[PDB]
Design a protein around this ligand. Structure first.
Ligand SMILES: NS(=O)(=O)[C@@H]1O[C@H](CO)[C@H](O)[C@H](O)[C@H]1O
Ligand SMILES: [Zn+2]
Length: 257
């Protein structure tokens, strides 16, 4: 099926998912000199105090840390968002080298990796219904650069050995996502889509200006994961990022000057 290889990568997705060449695809390059400061934007509210993590799974494309989204425990509000969005999972996109890995770029600059915290609009009842709506999801994107270690990320790094291959999952309770956030919540925002098939155009992207730092050792452990399932030939899980797409008829707004 779809993947990130030469024969099933991003360049091939449009054949099975024509929306890949749609009007509001992601990711995009954020040209800081074209983004418009919007003083009308409300303060961004990240309420992850009651976040309830459940499990970590290797899905063959990346690994997802899933949360219990049966109640308004961990939510995202404010900013360009109207209503309440519940956190359902987070995952990363990374490269084979430190100079690549992020999906969004800033003035064409690529970061080593990108964290995506996925939330769905509660007004729609469930995730499945939400992805069918133009304002169904809100994804918080955080860039990762190689430098000092990120304490809040080490817990995730410590369990990767237990989910090396596709299909593997491990218990991952009591994890605090607040430990993955940078100091500043300044951001850019624009209407976009999921960056992996089905590429649905249901996402309000909120990309933070300030990247978080992770150690070389931490990123290396991400690169030890496998795209393949147990027993199959090894294919290192690296470069699971989609390149920037045309901005077309869209404007990127900034929460800061
Ligand atoms: N990369 S992405 O747009 O957040 C994409 O979203 C999908 C729907 O939530 C799934 O979570 C994919 O795992 C994720 O990569
Ligand atoms: Zn993602």
């Amino acid at each position: 099926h779809w993947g990130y290889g030469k024969h099933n990568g991003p360049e091939h997705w449009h054949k099975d998912f024509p929306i890949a060449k749609g009007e509001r695809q992601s990711p995009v390059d954020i040209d800081t000199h074209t983004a418009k400061y919007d003083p009308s934007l409300k303060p961004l509210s990240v309420s992850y105090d009651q976040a309830t993590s459940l499990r970590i799974l290797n899905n063959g494309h990346a690994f997802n840390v899933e949360f219990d989204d049966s109640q308004d425990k961990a939510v995202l509000k404010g900013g360009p968002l109207d209503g309440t969005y519940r956190l359902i999972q987070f995952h990363f996109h990374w490269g084979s080298l430190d100079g690549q890995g992020s999906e969004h770029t800033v003035d064409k600059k690529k970061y080593a990796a990108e964290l995506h915290l996925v939330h769905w609009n509660t007004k729609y009842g469930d995730f499945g219904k939400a992805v069918q709506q133009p304002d169904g999801l809100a994804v918080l994107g955080i860039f990762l650069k190689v430098g000092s270690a990120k304490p809040g990320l080490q817990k995730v790094v410590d369990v990767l050995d237990s989910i090396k291959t596709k299909g593997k999952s491990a218990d991952f309770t009591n994890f605090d996502p607040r430990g993955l956030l940078p100091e500043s919540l300044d951001y850019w925002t624009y209407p976009g889509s999921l960056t992996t098939p089905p590429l649905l155009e249901c996402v309000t992207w909120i990309v933070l200006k300030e990247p978080i730092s992770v150690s070389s050792e931490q990123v290396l452990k991400f690169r030890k994961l496998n795209f393949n399932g147990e027993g199959e030939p090894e294919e290192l899980m690296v470069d699971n990022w989609r390149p920037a797409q045309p901005l077309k008829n869209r404007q990127i707004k900034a929460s800061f000057k």
